């Protein structure tokens, strides 16, 4: 009484994330950034916090090496989104600073992170959520965006230099 099977003749990695945006992406959702953290890059995450989900987490690893430059994790309970960054065999620190926490169990939430040169700019439903100080100088290297935990992703697309 069991169905479904991975079946992989030879372990390999998924192709590029080109083409149209993702629809109803599973979790954890692993979305590699084509290019990397570039001043002209904007990350967008449209999902919804389930009533049975404690909280999720959005970590940004590097496709090249594999280090986390930014690790944001919202907290529906207390109401504080912690920010960290795991470095090569090392770790950064815990950063908490927000004006309004929309993330709520039972209601949708539009999150959009902006990649810049001095720092990042996260927005929530048209509201400056918080900023992320450049911890890893090699931020540009970061070309991987993964999302684990308890979150209902609906639409995910890594806006790039395309629009122009």
UniProtKB/Swiss-Prot annotation:
Record's function text: Galectin that binds lactose and a related range of sugars. May be involved in the assembly of adherens junctions.
Keyword Glycosyltransferase: no
Residues recorded with modification Phosphoserine: 93
Domain Galectin: 29-158
A GO cellular-component term linked to this record: extracellular space
GO molecular function terms attached to this record: carbohydrate binding; galactoside binding
Swiss-Prot/TrEMBL keywords: Lectin, Phosphoprotein, Repeat
Binding positions (a beta-D-galactoside): 91-97
Name of the featured protein: Galectin-4
Known partners and oligomeric status: Monomer.
GO biological-process terms attached to the record: antibacterial peptide biosynthetic process; cell adhesion
Domain remarks: Contains two homologous but distinct carbohydrate-binding domains.
Top-level division of the source organism's lineage: Eukaryota
